[PDB]
Amino acid sequence: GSSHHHHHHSSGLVPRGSHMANSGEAPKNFGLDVKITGESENDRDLGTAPGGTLNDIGIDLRPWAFGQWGDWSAYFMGQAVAATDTIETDTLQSDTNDGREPDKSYLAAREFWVDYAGLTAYPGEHLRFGRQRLREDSGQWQDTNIEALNWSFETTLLNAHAGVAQRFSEYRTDLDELAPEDKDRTHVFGDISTQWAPHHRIGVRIHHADDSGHLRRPGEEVDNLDKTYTGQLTWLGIEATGDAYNYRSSMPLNYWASATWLTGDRDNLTTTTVDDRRIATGKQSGDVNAFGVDLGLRWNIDEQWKAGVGYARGSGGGKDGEEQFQQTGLESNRSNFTGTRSRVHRFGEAFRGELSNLQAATLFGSWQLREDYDASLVYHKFWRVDDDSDIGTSGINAALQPGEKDIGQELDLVVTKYFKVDEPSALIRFRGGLFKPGDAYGPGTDSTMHRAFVDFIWRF
Ligand SMILES: CCCCCC[Se]CCCCCCCC(=O)OC[C@@H](O)CO
Ligand SMILES: CCCCCC[Se]CCCCCCCC(=O)OC[C@@H](O)CO
Numbered sequence: 001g002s003s004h005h006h007h008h009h010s011s012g013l014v015p016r017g018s019h020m021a022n023s024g025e026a027p028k029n030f031g032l033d034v035k036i037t038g039e040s041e042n043d044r045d046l047g048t049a050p051g052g053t054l055n056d057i058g059i060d061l062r063p064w065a066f067g068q069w070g071d072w073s074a075y076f077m078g079q080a081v082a083a084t085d086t087i088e089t090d091t092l093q094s095d096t097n098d099g100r101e102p103d104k105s106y107l108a109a110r111e112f113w114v115d116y117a118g119l120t121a122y123p124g125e126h127l128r129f130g131r132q133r134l135r136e137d138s139g140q141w142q143d144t145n146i147e148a149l150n151w152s153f154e155t156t157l158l159n160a161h162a163g164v165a166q167r168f169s170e171y172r173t174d175l176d177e178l179a180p181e182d183k184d185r186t187h188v189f190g191d192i193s194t195q196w197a198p199h200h201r202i203g204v205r206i207h208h209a210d211d212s213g214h215l216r217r218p219g220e221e222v223d224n225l226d227k228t229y230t231g232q233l234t235w236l237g238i239e240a241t242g243d244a245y246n247y248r249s250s251m252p253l254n255y256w257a258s259a260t261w262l263t264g265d266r267d268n269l270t271t272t273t274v275d276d277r278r279i280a281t282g283k284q285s286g287d288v289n290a291f292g293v294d295l296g297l298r299w300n301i302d303e304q305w306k307a308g309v310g311y312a313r314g315s316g317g318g319k320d321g322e323e324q325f326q327q328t329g330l331e332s333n334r335s336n337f338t339g340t341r342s343r344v345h346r347f348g349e350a351f352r353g354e355l356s357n358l359q360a361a362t363l364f365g366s367w368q369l370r371e372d373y374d375a376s377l378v379y380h381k382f383w384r385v386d387d388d389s390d391i392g393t394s395g396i397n398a399a400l401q402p403g404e405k406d407i408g409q410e411l412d413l414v415v416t417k418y419f420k421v422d423e424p425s426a427l428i429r430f431r432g433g434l435f436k437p438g439d440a441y442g443p444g445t446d447s448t449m450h451r452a453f454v455d456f457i458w459r460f
């Protein structure tokens, strides 16, 4: 059930001989996830800088181990990667610089945790401690592997979670340092929701991020391992879904609606450039009072075909920047929002937008056939909310022109074959995004950019 160590994995594969494959089998105490990935990426900077291009291939091996003893259990997953350049074999990976340059080949400890399920007799209730997968269904608050203590309670009528998390390391042979935004940042979070009618859920969610770190002092040189800000930030959200992320729905329509208020304060570092160097000049504090919304509707046209629409907006700008929404930093923004077994990036495989000073309109269609195939075609159009503010993270490394709201448009295609089928144990997927920059990117930029993957995944 939901406590299974692979429950949140997007692949949704089931190894041969496992208890999930045949309930008469004993739970596996070990297994191996094998992934071969090709990536083509051109050009992440839209042709405004050297590099930014990938055409490369890699293998990623993830052995895992599991033990169970009454109410106690424990889990480890490691990772070994070898690739022809530094490609993305992990949709959850740390974004990347002395101590932050990935190697083409590396080892990592991905998960390591102990779990106690004995506080209540519900097997949907358990407490997990260690580096662990945290995920909620939208992917927009948490979808990551992180050191945490997290309590889950999942039953028919009531779901609830509460946890604390903090990065202390990447646990990787190549990344020696944390990203500055992660260093000394503690997260606490929880949620509670109820299935008020069958397949309809309403809930509230909270997340708090607190920075204990400090900013560089005036006159000190500032480099890429230094923070740009320290924050005490709270996200408070309402969320309603009707089979929003359920690829097996029988309802004719599915939907999601969420609204999130972001409050708190940030201390923003200021800098100046002095002879090929960046020098701290001070800092400025200010309130954040920002808002985000994400809405979607999916038509289940028949057992195979689905289509739908989405709108999302993260506020931007405002008085002294108070309306600049931002996400938690634990999100993936990947979800099953097209109604298939495959997860898709909600704001484009190429653009990979964070909901921050961003408005997006989305159209999609999908097709699936039992547990054997699925395919999705997604269109997005993106605009800034405030044309004099930056946006947040994205898969595009290029300057925005002041005063231009047209970020661009994107077309994505995801196509998947599942192999042994009752429950597949392997898959091959094409996942690609084509991004057409709009006027906010300005002259001298490429007319289109793409990011495309082929992934072959086998679980043993
Ligand atoms: C598991 C993944 C395997 C997938 C195999 C797909 Se092969 C087609 C990839 C399509 C990539 C085309 C880019 C080729 C290129 O342009 O090479 C530079 C050239 O000018 C001279 O070096
Ligand atoms: C230092 C350079 C050496 C690397 C050479 C190996 Se390129 C491995 C293929 C990597 C390209 C795969 C990306 C996805 C894609 O473009 O598939 C197109 C196809 O499936 C549509 O029919």
Ligand SMILES: CCCCCC[Se]CCCCCCCC(=O)OC[C@@H](O)CO
Binding pocket: 067, 069, 070, 074
């Ligand atoms: C840094 C972390 C510390 C390293 C070790 C923690 Se993982 C070893 C867990 C292994 C513990 C298994 C034993 C529990 C038990 O009760 O087994 C008896 C049997 O009768 C029950 O059915």
Ligand SMILES: CCCCCC[Se]CCCCCCCC(=O)OC[C@@H](O)CO
Binding pocket: 061, 062, 063, 077, 078, 079, 080, 107, 108, 109, 110, 171, 172, 173, 174
């Ligand atoms: C400063 C660096 C310290 C952090 C390093 C993490 Se410990 C080494 C990775 C520990 C994770 C164990 C799993 C890796 C693995 O064994 O993959 C091998 C593959 O050949 C199996 O088919």
Ligand SMILES: CCCCCC[Se]CCCCCCCC(=O)OC[C@@H](O)CO
Binding pocket: 129, 130, 131, 147, 148, 149, 164, 165, 166, 168, 169, 170, 171, 176, 177, 178, 186
């Ligand atoms: C607030 C939630 C806490 C949950 C903790 C549970 Se797991 C921590 C076990 C392991 C702790 C490892 C510490 C390693 C380290 O500090 O190395 C730094 C270096 O890699 C670069 O930062």
Ligand SMILES: CCCCCC[Se]CCCCCCCC(=O)OC[C@@H](O)CO
Binding pocket: 238, 239, 240, 257, 258, 259, 293
């Ligand atoms: C049951 C769960 C329900 C979740 C649904 C939330 Se719908 C939020 C309505 C959105 C209303 C917010 C108004 C924002 C605004 O003023 O737009 C800026 C304008 O000044 C410049 O274009």
Ligand SMILES: CCCCCC[Se]CCCCCCCC(=O)OC[C@@H](O)CO
Binding pocket: 238, 259, 261, 289, 290, 291, 315, 318, 322, 323
């Ligand atoms: C069915 C259950 C009821 C669901 C209630 C959700 Se109605 C969404 C109203 C939308 C509210 C927008 C608030 C905007 C904000 O707080 O940040 C910007 C500003 O305050 C900084 O000057």
Ligand SMILES: CCCCCC[Se]CCCCCCCC(=O)OC[C@@H](O)CO
Binding pocket: 040, 042, 411, 412, 413, 432, 433, 434, 450, 451, 452
């Ligand atoms: C109708 C559906 C469109 C949806 C977007 C799928 Se991404 C398009 C490229 C994905 C296909 C393979 C990657 C292309 C490639 O390798 O060429 C490199 C070369 O063009 C350098 O610009």
Ligand SMILES: CCCCCC[Se]CCCCCCCC(=O)OC[C@H](O)CO
Binding pocket: 029, 065, 066, 067, 068, 074, 075, 076, 112, 113, 114, 129, 130, 131
């Ligand atoms: C900071 C949080 C703790 C991290 C724990 C890493 Se546990 C490594 C794999 C743990 C999975 C089981 C370990 C030992 C075992 O199972 O021996 C008993 C027998 O084989 C049962 O079948």
Ligand SMILES: CCCCCC[Se]CCCCCCCC(=O)OC[C@H](O)CO
Binding pocket: 076, 109, 112, 169, 171, 172
């Ligand atoms: C019963 C014990 C079973 C666990 C054995 C698995 Se090997 C340890 C991998 C998981 C533990 C993390 C290892 C990497 C690390 O600690 O690096 C921190 C940083 O480099 C320091 O600053």
Ligand SMILES: CCCCCC[Se]CCCCCCCC(=O)OC[C@H](O)CO
Binding pocket: 151, 162, 163, 188, 189, 190, 206, 207, 208, 234
């Ligand atoms: C089964 C054991 C569970 C017991 C642990 C309960 Se912790 C509740 C999680 C909820 C997370 C709390 C967040 C608090 C916050 O962020 O307030 C900041 C303030 O508003 C700034 O203005």
Ligand SMILES: CCCCCC[Se]CCCCCCCC(=O)OC[C@H](O)CO
Binding pocket: 160, 161, 162, 189, 190, 191, 192, 204, 205, 206, 236, 237
């Ligand atoms: C059968 C009834 C049991 C009642 C007592 C059980 Se206390 C469980 C501790 C942990 C409960 C989780 C708390 C997280 C939360 O509800 O916060 C979300 C929201 O944002 C808040 O504003």
Ligand SMILES: CCCCCC[Se]CCCCCCCC(=O)OC[C@H](O)CO
Binding pocket: 157, 158, 192, 193, 194, 202, 203, 204, 236, 237, 238, 261
């Ligand atoms: C089996 C029975 C379980 C009963 C548990 C009920 Se959980 C439903 C919560 C859904 C209630 C929505 C409350 C709206 C709200 O307080 O948001 C304010 C906004 O976020 C502040 O800015």
Ligand SMILES: CCCCCC[Se]CCCCCCCC(=O)OC[C@H](O)CO
Binding pocket: 299, 301, 307, 308, 309, 363, 364, 365, 377, 378, 379
């Ligand atoms: C990027 C690709 C474009 C995405 C389309 C966006 Se919305 C289309 C959903 C609306 C489609 C639902 C209508 C199906 C229907 O009308 O069935 C036939 C008739 O009613 C007998 O039942």
Ligand SMILES: CCCCCC[Se]CCCCCCCC(=O)OC[C@H](O)CO
Binding pocket: 301, 302, 305, 306, 307, 364, 365, 366, 367, 375, 376, 377
């Ligand atoms: C690349 C994979 C996805 C392709 C994009 C699909 Se766009 C619309 C999706 C679904 C619409 C397609 C037609 C639906 C149908 O065939 O049945 C309609 C019948 O009139 C009612 O019973």
Ligand SMILES: CCCCCC[Se]CCCCCCCC(=O)OC[C@H](O)CO
Binding pocket: 369, 372, 373, 415, 416, 417, 428, 429, 430, 454
């Ligand atoms: C290099 C990347 C490859 C990624 C996956 C390509 Se799968 C072709 C899907 C296209 C599926 C169209 C029709 C499918 C169907 O109905 O097949 C019945 C089936 O054979 C019953 O076994």
Ligand code: NA
Binding pocket: 006, 014, 015, 018, 028, 031
């Ligand atoms: Na398994």
Ligand code: NA
Binding pocket: 027, 028, 029, 030, 066
């Ligand atoms: Na298992």
